[PDB]
Symmetry: D3
């Protein structure tokens, strides 16, 4: 397969126009997209160690969920220099699907909704991010699923008691901003996401929203693993994971 064909397949699953405004999705680093691809690597982050591992494992198409850069730059030194040097010197293509992969059908948020078997799931935000629906079971059962499948030691902000058959909101990645807490508190009893910080914990306690931080990494890697299986099943291509 050619790089552009891999990109075509991925964009059919996760169309770029589903990405939220300003999200740096698509080609991160690359020039010739007609090149035949020897090995595909999948990672959450285009980190320096991921990129070093890509070169070591002979990966020539590196797919990541997070973009290489959010903020644009005009000097190339330090860590970004080391990263670009490896990608360019080895002609490794770097391509990202970020919020388009969060939002698309069977994408990262759908993977969470399906894991918890949410009843009548809907998008949490108007832009399509996150899912919300009824968890048909006890709070304890929800926690066991979280601990078994996502993360063993989640932070639980137990802001109030949770009855059976509650509204569960899920957001893969960083969903625990203060403004998100305020928003989700109007829509759900429990909010499962990642990257909890102090001010957001206090706000959830005030609003009575139960928050479960199963970490940014794990709430995304759960769906990313499913995405990797989908690619492996459909493409005649060697595919490896680099930071999971």
């Amino acid at each position: 397969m050619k790089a552009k064909e891999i990109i075509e397949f991925i964009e059919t699953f996760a169309p770029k126009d589903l990405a939220i405004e300003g999200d740096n999705i698509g080609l991160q680093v690359g020039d010739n997209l007609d090149k035949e691809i020897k090995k595909l690597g999948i990672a959450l982050d285009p980190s320096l160690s991921v990129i070093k591992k890509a070169e070591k494992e002979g990966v020539d198409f590196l797919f990541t969920h997070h973009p290489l850069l959010k903020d644009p730059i005009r000097n190339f030194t330090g860590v970004i220099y080391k990263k670009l040097k490896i990608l360019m010197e080895n002609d490794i293509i770097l391509y990202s699907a970020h919020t388009n992969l969060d939002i698309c059908k069977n994408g990262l948020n759908d993977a969470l909704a399906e894991l918890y078997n949410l009843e009548n799931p809907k998008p949490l935000y108007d832009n399509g991010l996150g899912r919300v629906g009824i968890f048909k079971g006890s709070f304890e059962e929800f926690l066991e699923i979280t601990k078994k499948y996502i993360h063993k030691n989640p932070i639980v902000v137990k802001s109030k008691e949770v009855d059976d058959n509650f509204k569960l909101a899920v957001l893969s990645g960083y969903g625990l901003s203060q403004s998100s807490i305020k928003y989700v508190a109007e829509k759900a009893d429990v909010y499962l996401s990642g990257d909890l910080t102090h001010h957001s914990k206090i706000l959830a306690e005030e609003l009575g929203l139960v928050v479960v931080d199963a970490t940014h990494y794990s709430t995304e890697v759960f769906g990313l693993k499913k995405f990797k299986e989908f690619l492996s099943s459909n493409l005649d291509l060697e595919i490896i994971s680099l930071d999971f």
Copy 2:
């Protein structure tokens, strides 16, 4: 028999308001007549709803907090903010905050951390005076043991590289672990002690080789806030209690 304005004078002598960084909402949060006599002072990290309820329950007349009531301004009064204000106003509880001016001032929250680790030749970490950095005269393991004994029993350690003895330690009380902070501090220190670590910042520290120790936002401020509470208790003839620590 102290007046609210005299408590405010005492606090602002320790932590002058002009030390606060641009835009920080410090000073009087809620209150009108500052000639009011104050019988009981409450100290808290956060002006949360539960802290404010506890203040009312305990007969607190002056509520001092590190964090301001609001960061972003509002023009409607409903829900939680309505509930908070209602309690403060019907009890005429004054709410007053010292935030980054208390981080930055001499013997404030960052100085308290610097003194705990006995930093050699300490300097402000940032140009605006936030944080401290200097040499820790000992091993990484000794630095960790101090952290576990006095700050947080189990901090997250991002061990991005090996750390030699007599290393450069930067400390910042509260939330110091933004991505831009990681990048900045990596140029100034081997080890960075602060709070509120998140994923992108963890990855960035590993790339840069900066060892990051997250002893939490709460604990890295409450360490110094307890010192500030003792300082107030020693100098003021006033009943003083802590509400969320």
Copy 3:
């Protein structure tokens, strides 16, 4: 005469003056309040949520305070001085404060319609694109228009008589503050005479240059005319004691 829940009063008011009619950025709706199941015995109406209005509301046992102007235009993050005094009174008495501002200016039979109907404007149209103000032909003389103004709105309006006004002229009306320099420039292309409130020096000079006759019947009176109509409307439909506080 019975008691209503606050949410029922709000629902009625918003059917008359829908919130989506408000112009961009206008702070309309709930100003101060939490539980809208609160039972309401006495509804108070005011132009302004002033300190004296709020004191009178407390004094008169008002449970629901409706005002045309919002409590705050610019948001705040400290609560001291006057705003402290106002909120303390409202919160201690759990008085709900609710506002309908430009949505009440713009809606059918709202404040601007009330003026257009008073002057019996022929073929009235909205004055601005956002629906604010009204303009049409006044079927009469300038003096007849002034006497109507004097009888119903304000007895001694300031008249900037920029030119002679012939019978059957184009009259623009805007309830409240409609006399900014940019408004004078805009309305000068649309009307012979502009009736509104809050005239200041640079706007007077500008009107004289443009030949636009301006009548300042005051911000207060040009809104209160329609606010009285609104109060009568509520009194006719709601079984509630309803009082006016600053008019």
Copy 4:
């Protein structure tokens, strides 16, 4: 006798342009050759169309106004501004303004008001130098009588509270009655004399207990402008007339 540039130098010695507040469009409004000989100088508050027509009718060569011709810039020349510019350009009448620099300078428009009321220990009201404030050594009624005799016969008085003798009086020539000004001045004075009162500012003054006297924008400026005109007449051998006062 005199060239325009000499008239300008004299005015700018009295009211230096660097006194004008940021963004104020002061100085040469319309003109090219400043060596032009000037026989007749006209002074006006506003560079209005009727003032400019009168300048042309009276053979004015140099038109001085307090207010600038334009606050906001334009890139098309039609309607009233076309009419104004055509009269000035076709007659090579120079139009020059001193606006807030004339408000702020020593013996300028605000100083003229301070001196009329014989304010004790006067200070600038704002940090940028606008307005004056000091003690009025007399009763409220005496202050009002001075106001009515020398400034405007029927000022609007917002009597927000009782005013005792020897009160703090703030004065600002022109438009000083914005909401943000009311809030500011309420901290500094018992009584505020200025112009261009509107509804929201009246309500706010009542809430704050600030007594406000609107003696109008026009009259509170023209008082000092008449003084300025006499000063010019005393010092320049030039025919000098006033156009809108």
Copy 5:
């Protein structure tokens, strides 16, 4: 059979050919200087620029209505001194109307860009930019023939940035006026082999060389005046009015 027209009739005619809503966002088109548009017009003058020398020549020649492609001012002002004072004074004391059709004249059918596309007989021309500016299509011939046309009809010594060899039947982009900004070079490199426009500067030359876009600078003036002459001929054919050109 030469008569006087009212200014508003001239404006109506021009705006029928080049409607104001074709002008790009922010473009200062329409009436520049003037008040009464019932003014009777005996002599219409056409110019590229409302320069001081053009306005002086207009006054000298008794022009009553001055039409220019470029607006008098792009950026607004609030003081009237120096050159703009000199210009406005001449226009106002003589009550000469100044009116401009700028990008609406660039974009309209048979406007300045179409005139270039037609001169090069572009095959299947399309607007170069989405807002309608410029034209692009196939030049059915050799690069050398394209050059000969350029030299004969537009400008005798055009600057050629020969970034690569150009084969016959290439994609030719044209933009009348200043089309050679860096952002334009980048954009057009994706759409054409050759870019004919005006006002080349150093950074743009380097960028064109990097991208392999052949750029031909036939000057800002000449790439617009070619079409402006057509426009003047069009007016002369349709209005029974004396019409002269002032800076061409």
Copy 6:
């Protein structure tokens, strides 16, 4: 045996980075390890693709340019910038720029022009230090002949007016012929020597009566850049070649 950081130190001593105007992207463009030993330094006006290819071909390990690689920041790497970065990174070629700091410094690109024309009592043209202006002690024709001999054989001359002997000459290396520059310099000089003339600026200069001589952006910079190259060659024991001049 000299290190990249030592080359950079030498250059920044001559042209300190703090002389660069606000926002100018000067300093290290591409590079990581500045302890690297440098065997061959290349000097160029532009970090163009052809310059960078030539640098690789000639074995240049330190590439110095006047113009920065990027003015506007990017967050994707494709096309031409990909090709350029790849060549630099795969060969570990350092790219370093001194832009307006080299324009402004003593004996920098603008001083070099001022010295060529032997300007009398030269001063900076702009407040930020850009450009130079002073008296040319000779005729306009003598000035043109110097230009033709040393800078550019055939400069564009916009002869807006006649020029008397001993006129005021302003020089600015590179692109100095913006419309706002034309307006500014017309107040300070009779003749303006710079580069990159476009139509609107030509018209404006004719209106103002400012004589403009466009000796091209490239040539007015390369003149001083050659001087800078000789200065480096005279002081550093290093192979130094020029790449686009």
